[PDB]
């Protein structure tokens, strides 16, 4: 699963929310958060699209978008407010074990970068979504309703942080809807010096190795060497 | 399979018994065949073919390890033992080969008369 | 009077790097799972008693 700022359709922890980092005091390192229970997210593109074919050469066709029938509305995702509040409370409780009993922990949105990094980017049934998660990370913690994230759609895609190979995604016909589980986070910390009693965490991501490091973290590969020599008191006849 | 990794040496001595994916499969098959053949040949050149515990004719040099038989088979694991005698493995391996060649020559000499 | 004895099948292992292949549960998909080996229905797992190993999440090959 390729996504940023949010791990989807993965595995869950078994006892508590897990916080992992290479060096937790180095703020240049990403923090990986593994959830205990998943958070449902509903994403939809509600336009009824149309596809047309244009012959650009002998045996070559280009699939363009025709006319949307009906009204034109914005694509969006929905998350539950209470479940997100509970999950953030648990994450804060487990994060305080590395920063102390009495530190103020606040969540603020991302800051700077390209659209892939500053937004929750994913792919729902052919279409590529980039959603604004400024309502997910906006709070401060001191020791029925829904949250709607508006999303944009892009058709020319640059993957794997490469330059020189773009890809065009042909249109998908009809309304699009999907349901996913949020099961983790990728976070970063700000370098607050000069006797800072508060810590600020911002969503991160962009490198896909951290996505599959959250699945291959309990595995290692070893080589078997089933041949040994030892001393005894017995001799070959 | 690897179930006696944490037991003593003596306890463990009783229980010794194209495309992206298509290219990766073939290398694994070749590696498995290579490893099996190498182990079988190494066992064979020592005269130990067809056995899981094989008695040799090479005396143990006390400079390899000076411990008694009580703190080897009742106090260590094979992973601990492998860390001690890792520097002397090739010496013993050459000694075994020379010893087996001498045995072959002696058997030929016995059949000669 | 001690002699060398050879044991074939001892439980020793070392850290290594190798090529892992793919197995998938038994057509046009980006990751060609149709070219992968079928999966065993009930895989075998062996618990290793009295064994402590060292893992590193951030240097996995």
């Amino acid at each position: 699963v390729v996504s940023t700022q949010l791990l989807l359709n993965g595995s869950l922890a078994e006892e508590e929310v897990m916080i992992r980092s290479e060096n937790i005091t180095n703020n240049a390192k990403n923090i990986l958060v593994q959830f205990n229970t998943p958070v449902q997210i509903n994403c939809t593109r509600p336009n009824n699209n149309t596809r047309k074919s244009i012959r650009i050469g002998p045996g070559q066709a280009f699939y363009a978008t025709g006319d949307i029938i009906g009204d034109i509305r914005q694509a969006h995702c929905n998350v539950s407010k209470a479940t997100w509040n509970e999950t953030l409370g648990k994450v804060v409780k487990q994060l305080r074990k590395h920063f102390g009993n009495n530190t103020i922990i606040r969540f603020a949105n991302s800051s700077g970068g390209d659209l892939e990094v500053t937004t929750h980017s994913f792919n729902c049934g052919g279409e590529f979504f980039y959603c604004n998660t400024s309502g997910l990370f906006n709070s401060t913690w001191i020791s029925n309703d829904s949250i709607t994230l508006p999303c944009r759609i892009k058709q020319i895609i640059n993957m794997w942080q490469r330059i020189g190979q773009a890809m065009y995604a042909p249109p998908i016909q009809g309304v699009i809807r999907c349901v996913s589980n949020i099961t983790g986070l990728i976070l970063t910390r700000d370098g607050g010096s000069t006797n800072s009693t508060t810590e600020t965490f911002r969503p991160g991501g962009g490198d896909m190795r951290d996505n599959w490091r959250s699945e291959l973290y309990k595995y290692k590969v070893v080589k078997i060497e089933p041949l040994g020599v030892a001393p005894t008191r017995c001799k070959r006849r | 399979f690897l179930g006696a990794a944490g037991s003593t040496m003596g306890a463990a001595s009783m229980t010794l018994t194209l495309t992206v994916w298509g290219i990766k499969q073939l290398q694994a098959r070749v590696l498995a065949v290579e490893r099996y053949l190498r182990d079988q040949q190494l066992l064979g050149i020592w005269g130990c073919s067809g056995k899981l515990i094989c008695c040799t004719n090479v005396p143990w040099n006390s400079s390899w390890s000076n411990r008694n038989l009580s703190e080897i088979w009742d106090n260590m694991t094979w992973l601990q033992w492998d860390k001690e005698i890792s520097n002397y493995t090739q010496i013993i391996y050459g000694l075994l080969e020379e010893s087996q060649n001498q045995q072959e020559k002696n058997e030929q000499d016995l059949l000669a008369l | 009077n001690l002699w060398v004895t050879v044991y074939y099948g001892v439980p020793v292992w070392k850290d290594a790097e190798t090529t892992l292949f793919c197995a998938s549960d038994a057509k046009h998909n980006v990751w060609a799972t149709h070219a992968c080996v079928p999966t065993d229905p009930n895989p075998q797992e062996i618990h290793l008693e009295n064994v402590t190993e060292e893992f590193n999440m951030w240097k996995n090959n």
């Epitope: 008191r233 | 037991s7 003593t8 009783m14 008695c55 088979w73 | 008693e49």
Partner: antibody, heavy 127, light 107 residues
């Protein structure tokens, strides 16, 4: 640490049978060696029988041939000693002991003695 | 195989060294062990393989010998050492014990 736990005291009559159990903790049961040793009041130690669960063939002294049986339950990690046709001289304290062994291949097993002992069970044969 | 222990009883002061001799009817190589038993308690193994000391045993106990003669030496006698010492052979079945040597502290 390896620990052996035995059953409680027993009173029996002459001609009856007695069964004692010994449960092992902290070792792989199948590859360990278990032995039974009895002590009469005011006397020395006597070896009755020894047995490795994996091999499964107990070894007995000739004085107790036909009256002594040593069995093992691997799932319960227990070993049982059964003595039959009890006599007045069979009143004693019975200990269950354990020790490690190793193999050099070809039916050869070498031992180190009994390193772990149980607390003992008192068996009294009287009317 | 019969194991003969000498002496049957022994009394010595604290800090003194005592010697117990175990003799085998036939050779048993190194398969001899020394056990100590206190009244009302299970035996505790002191020496294995004739001369190898068990873990946790004080160094004042030493074992020696081979063939058919073995020796157990207690160099620094202590009041805690009053007990019965046994030699046991485990080289050949059936395993046999000695008749025991009683060591008493003289004060």
């Amino acid at each position: 640490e390896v620990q052996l736990v035995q059953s409680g005291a027993e009173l029996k009559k002459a001609g009856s049978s007695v069964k004692l159990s010994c449960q092992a903790y902290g070792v792989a049961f199948s590859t360990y060696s278990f032995h039974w040793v009895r002590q009469a009041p005011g006397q020395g130690l006597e070896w009755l029988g020894g047995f490795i669960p994996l091999v499964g063939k107990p070894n007995y002294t000739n004085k107790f041939r036909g009256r002594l049986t040593i069995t093992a339950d691997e799932s319960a990690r227990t070993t049982y000693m059964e003595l039959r046709s009890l006599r007045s001289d069979d009143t004693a304290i019975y200990y269950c002991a354990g020790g490690g062994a190793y193999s050099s291949g070809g039916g050869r097993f070498h031992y180190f003695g009994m390193a772990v002992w149980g607390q003992g069970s008192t068996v009294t044969v009287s009317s | 195989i019969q194991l003969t222990q000498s002496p049957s009883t022994l009394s010595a002061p604290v800090g003194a060294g005592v010697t117990i001799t175990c003799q085998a009817s036939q050779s048993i190589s190194n398969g001899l062990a020394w056990y100590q038993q206190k009244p009302g308690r299970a035996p505790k193994m002191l020496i294995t393989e004739g001369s190898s000391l068990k873990s946790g045993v004080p160094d004042r106990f030493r074992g020696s010998g081979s063939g058919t003669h073995f020796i157990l030496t207690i160099s620094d006698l202590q009041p805690d050492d009053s007990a019965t010492y046994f030699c046991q052979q485990y080289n050949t079945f059936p395993w046999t014990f000695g008749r025991g040597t009683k060591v008493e502290i003289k004060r």
